């Protein structure tokens, strides 16, 4: 019945978020909801290269216009978080690509 | 005068932005009536907002406690601004004087 | 029998309302009871609980819905799991402040 641009958000963890032995490792949280088609590509970019492993991604599942979400998990660890590296979700919609930068500067 | 017995902070020269609210807060942690009227954003790219509040006259008077917390999406550390009658303060009355100009100035015309 | 990872998570620091993820993972068994708390205030409404997923290990994932300015406000946000009659609390923050 419709059709709506899928929106792009990302999680990141807080200063206290990491635990574990050292070196301590922590998930990163891209979601997308309220978007259609269901089918969905998730991707993490970091500097530039893909992540080709260390990463799940949820089955979508639902949540008038018909609703799916869509959860991927990332592994990362403590040190690449305080060079101030740069994670980005890629997200393909229809042949559109989504991308939402985030970082830990303030 | 005017029976309008409020107080306001002000904010100056933050990002022009949204989502700001301006909350009043007393010594006892009791939250109070929200406020209306809301600025805009200024030619010279700087944001205003004020948050009005109502008060008592005898609570002034009283001297108690009042805090401002200012809620800016750039500052992540809400600073506290304390405002608050200085009692113990002795009662004047005022004399007015009225100085005339001098002979002196009235040449250029 | 193993004490279920407490993790919670933040809105990014250069912006996006939002919403809060507490996740319990590698803990057994499957029953487990997680909730949400504001400034030591319990929280009535606003919240909603995922079916729990198998990862043997299961995963529980809790949703809370968090307005901008509230959580700009300093306010704190702990996750509360109770699992094998012991209590678990996390405490998070503002990291730029």
Known sequence: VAEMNPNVNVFVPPRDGFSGPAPRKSKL?????????????????????????????????????????????????????????????????????????????? | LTKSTKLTCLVTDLTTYDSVTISWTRQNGEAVKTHTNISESHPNATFSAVGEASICEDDWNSGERFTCTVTHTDLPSPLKQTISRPKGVALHRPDVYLLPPAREQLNLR
């Open chain 1, 29 to 106: 949280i891209c979601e997308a909801t309220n978007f259609t088609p269901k089918p969905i590509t998730v991707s993490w970019l970091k500097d530039g290269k893909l992540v080709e492993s260390g990463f799940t991604t949820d089955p979508v599942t639902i949540e008038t216009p018909q609703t799916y979400k869509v959860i991927s998990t990332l592994t990362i660890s403590e040190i690449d978080w305080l060079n101030l590296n740069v994670y980005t979700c890629r997200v393909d919609h229809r042949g559109l690509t989504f991308l939402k930068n985030v970082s830990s500067t303030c």
